């Protein structure tokens, strides 16, 4: 089992998320 | 089982998510 | 079993999601 | 079993989702 | 075997704008 | 075997606008 | 064998607009 | 075997703008 | 089982997250 | 085996702007 | 506009979800 | 606008979720 | 706008989540 | 705008989470 | 805007989390 | 006006079993 | 006006079992 | 106006079991 | 106005068991 | 106005058990 992945990203201005995992709760009780 | 993937992204201005996983709850009790 | 995938995206301004998985709850009890 | 897929997307302004999976609950009890 | 090539140009410009890309999580 | 080539130009421009792309999660 | 080629131009422009692309999740 | 090549130009410019990319988590 | 991954990112101005995992609570009781 | 090559140019410039990228966690 | 809801659940053994919202991606690129 | 909700749950053994919101990504690139 | 909610839970053994919000990424690149 | 919430939980043995928000990444690059 | 919340929890043995926010990374590069 | 009453008994028992309720998310 | 009453008994018992409720997230 | 009353009994018992409630996040 | 009342009994007992509630985060 | 009252009994007992509630963060 061989798994090959290639990522090439070009960003000028990044205000959000790139190749990122974000967890937020923002819960109210 | 061989799995090959290639990603090439060009972004000028990113305000959202690129190649990203986001989790939000925003729940109310 | 060989699986080959190629992705090429060009984005000027991204306000949403590109190649992304989003989970939101937004539930009310 | 060989499966080949090619994706080429050109976007000027993205406010929604491109090649993305979105889950929202928006449930009320 | 798989080969990928790319030789292009991308351009995105936001000009003279206000309240751009405000997000809340 | 699979080959992919691309040699193009992309352009996206937002000009003189207000309240663009406001998102809430 | 499969080959894909592309040599084109794309253009998207939003001009002089308000309250564009407001989303709520 | 797999090979990947790239020789392009990317450009993103935000000019004369206010309240750009305000985020809250 | 061989797994090979290559990441090449070019960023001019980064105000968000690149190749990062973010956890926030923002909960209210 | 896998090979990766890259020879390009990237450019991002924010000019004459105010309240850019304000974030709160 | 008045909305009244009453929930009464009796469970012996719960292996799944009760009054719950679940989001899973399980996506492959 | 009045909204009234009452929840009464009796659980012996809970292995899953009760009155809960779950987000999982489980994504593969 | 009046919103009233009452929660009454009785649990013997809890191995999962009760009135809880969970976020997991479990992502692979 | 008046919002009133009452929570009454009885737990014998708690091995999971009660009225809790959990964030986990578990990501692999 | 008046917001009133009442919490009453009875726990015999707590091995997990009660009214708590937990953040874990567990990431691998 | 709405009234709800309940005065019953519930019972669920798993006995002498293996590999019960295995879940994967 | 709404009234809710309950006066019942609940019972759940797992006995002499193995590999019960294994979860993975 | 809303009223809630409860006067009941709950019972959950795990006996003589192995590998119960193993979770991984 | 809202009123809440409760007068009940809760019971949870794990007896003669091994490897109970093993969690990993 | 809101009032809350409670007058009950809670009981949780782990007896004659091994490797109970092992957690790792």
DSSP letters along T1-25, please? Answer: -EEE----EEEEEEES-EEES-EE-
- Min Cα distance M15 → chain C (Å) is 22
Give, as one character, the DSSP assignment of residue F24. Answer: E
Expressed in percent and rounded to 5, the helix, strand and coil fractions of chain M are: 0, 70, 30
Q: Specify whether the CB–CB gap between L12 and Q13 falls below 8 A.
A: yes
- Min Cα distance E20 → chain C (Å) is 9
Contact list, L24 vs chain P (CB under 8 Å): 25
Question: What are the residues facing K14 on neighbouring strands?
Answer: L14
Which residue from K2, K21, Q24 is spatially nearest to A27, judged by alpha carbons? K21
Q: Specify whether the CB–CB gap between O29 and A21 falls below 8 A.
A: no
Q: Specify whether the CB–CB gap between A17 and I16 falls below 8 A.
A: yes
Contact list, N17 vs chain I (CB under 8 Å): none
Q: How far is CA P19 from CA L12, M23, O1, R25, S19, in A?
A: 19, 26, 51, 20, 15
Question: What is the b/e burial string over G5-16, where b = at least 16 CB atoms within 10 angstroms of the residue's CB?
Answer: eeeeebebebee
- Supply E2's token pair: 């798989």
Neighbours of I5 (CB within 10 A): 17
| CA G23/CA I9 separation, integer angstroms | 29
| CA K20/CA G25 separation, integer angstroms | 18
Q: Specify whether the CB–CB gap between E10 and B10 falls below 8 A.
A: yes
Task: Please give the order of strands across the beta sheet that includes R9-15.
Answer: P9-15, Q9-15, R9-15, S9-15, T9-15
Residue L26: phi and psi, rounded to 5, are: 50, 40
CB under 8 Å to P6, separation ≥6 — which residues? K8, Q5, Q6, Q7, Q8
Q: What is the resolution of this structure in A?
A: 2.9
CB under 8 Å to I13, separation ≥6 — which residues? A12, A13, A14, J12, J13, J14, J21
| CA B24/CA B6 separation, integer angstroms | 28
- Min Cα distance M26 → chain S (Å) is 11
Give, as one character, the DSSP assignment of residue K28. Answer: B
Residue P4: phi and psi, rounded to 5, are: -130, 135
Give, as one character, the DSSP assignment of residue H24. Answer: E
| CA B9/CA D14 separation, integer angstroms | 14
Task: Extract the runs of DSSP E, i.e. beta strands, from R1-25.
Answer: 2-4, 9-15, 18-20, 23-24
The DSSP H or E segment spanning E13 is strand E9-15
| CA D22/CA C21 separation, integer angstroms | 6
* M27 closest CB neighbour out of A7, A21, A29: A21
By the 10 Å C-beta count (0-12 exposed, 13-18 middle, 19+ buried), L21 is classed as buried
Neighbours of F1 (CB within 10 A): 10
Q: What is the DSSP string of chain P?
A: -EEE----EEEEEEES-EEES-EE-
Query: Which approach determined this entry?
Result: cryo-EM
Q: Specify whether the CB–CB gap between R23 and L22 falls below 8 A.
A: no
Any chains having at least 3 CB pairs less than 8 A from chain D are C, F, G, K, L
Question: What are the residues facing D8 on neighbouring strands?
Answer: C8
Any chains having at least 3 CB pairs less than 8 A from chain H are A, B, E, I, J
Neighbours of N1 (CB within 10 A): 9
Neighbours of O10 (CB within 10 A): 17
Q: Specify whether the CB–CB gap between M26 and N26 falls below 8 A.
A: yes
Searching chain K, which residue's CA lies closest to the CA of residue C29?
K19
- Supply E6's token pair: 């790319």
Expressed in percent and rounded to 5, the helix, strand and coil fractions of chain K are: 0, 70, 30
Q: Specify whether the CB–CB gap between C23 and E25 falls below 8 A.
A: no
Would the CB atoms of M4 and S6 count as touching at under 8 Å?
no
SS3 F25: coil
Angle at Q15 between CA Q9 and CA Q20, to 5 degrees: 105
Contact list, E15 vs chain F (CB under 8 Å): 13-16
- Min Cα distance T1 → chain O (Å) is 10
Q: Counting one residue from L and one from M, how many pairs have CB atoms under 8 Å apart?
A: 95
Q: How far is CA P15 from CA F22, S13, S14, S17, in A?
A: 55, 17, 15, 15
Q: Specify whether the CB–CB gap between M4 and K3 falls below 8 A.
A: no
Please enumerate residues of I whose Cβ is less than 8 A from a Cβ of A: 1-29
Contact list, J5 vs chain A (CB under 8 Å): none
Give, as one character, the DSSP assignment of residue K29. Answer: -
| CA N16/CA N8 separation, integer angstroms | 17
Q: How far is CA G21 from CA A16, A26, F25, in A?
A: 17, 23, 14
Please enumerate residues of L whose Cβ is less than 8 A from a Cβ of C: 5, 7, 19, 21, 23-25, 27
- Min Cα distance M8 → chain N (Å) is 5
Q: How far is CA P2 from CA K3, M10, Q5, Q8, in A?
A: 11, 24, 12, 20
Would the CB atoms of Q8 and K10 count as touching at under 8 Å?
yes
* G12 closest CB neighbour out of C12, C15, C22: C12
- Supply P19's token pair: 């590999």
Placement of tokens 């691309």 in the chain: F6
By the 10 Å C-beta count (0-12 exposed, 13-18 middle, 19+ buried), F10 is classed as buried
Q: How far is CA K5 from CA C27, D28, F6, L5, M7, in A?
A: 16, 11, 58, 5, 12
Contact list, J10 vs chain I (CB under 8 Å): 10-12
| CA M12/CA H12 separation, integer angstroms | 58
| CA I29/CA C25 separation, integer angstroms | 18
| CA E4/CA B6 separation, integer angstroms | 8
Which residue from E8, T3, G3 is spatially nearest to H11, judged by alpha carbons? E8
Please enumerate residues of F whose Cβ is less than 8 A from a Cβ of C: 2, 4, 6, 8, 10-14, 20-21, 23, 25
Angle at M21 between CA T3 and CA D23, to 5 degrees: 125
SS3 A20: coil
Would the CB atoms of L18 and K19 count as touching at under 8 Å?
yes
Task: Please give the order of strands across the beta sheet that includes D21-24.
Answer: D21-24, C21-24, B21-24, A21-24, I21-24
């Amino acid at each position: 089992t061989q798994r090959l992945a290639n990522f090439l990203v070009h960003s000028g201005n990044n205000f959000g998320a790139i190749l990122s995992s974000t967890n937020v709760g923002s819960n109210t009780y």
